[PDB]
Design a protein around this ligand. Sequence first.
Ligand code: K0J
Length: 119
Amino acid sequence: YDIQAWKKQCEELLNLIFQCEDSEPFRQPVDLLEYPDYRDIIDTPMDFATVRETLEAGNYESPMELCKDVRLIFSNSKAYTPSKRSRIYSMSLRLSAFFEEHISSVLSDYKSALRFHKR
Ligand SMILES: CCNC(=O)c1c[nH]nn1
């Protein structure tokens, strides 16, 4: 029933993602000195510290908005990878599976609570 519960649930999931070794390439914005052509390929950079900062600033209204930005971290990795076998892309796929497995109940509980609120 709690329409605000998603926020702490997302904070806890972000904490788990930061402890996961697979999140290392995605914890901070991609370094342009490391990947000089990054902005020629990626229009909208995204990373987990930016997601956490947006959440802590009170700049997400719903967990769907947070989801959209986390999914953008993974689609940017898929678009930038030179190979479906690359180390960083392979890390992104495992981390995406872990994220999707955990965000499912957050989204469901939020949408259910909002439907109850507007009944
Ligand atoms: C963190 C920026 N690099 C990537 O997303 C990447 C590199 N190889 N495969 N994907």
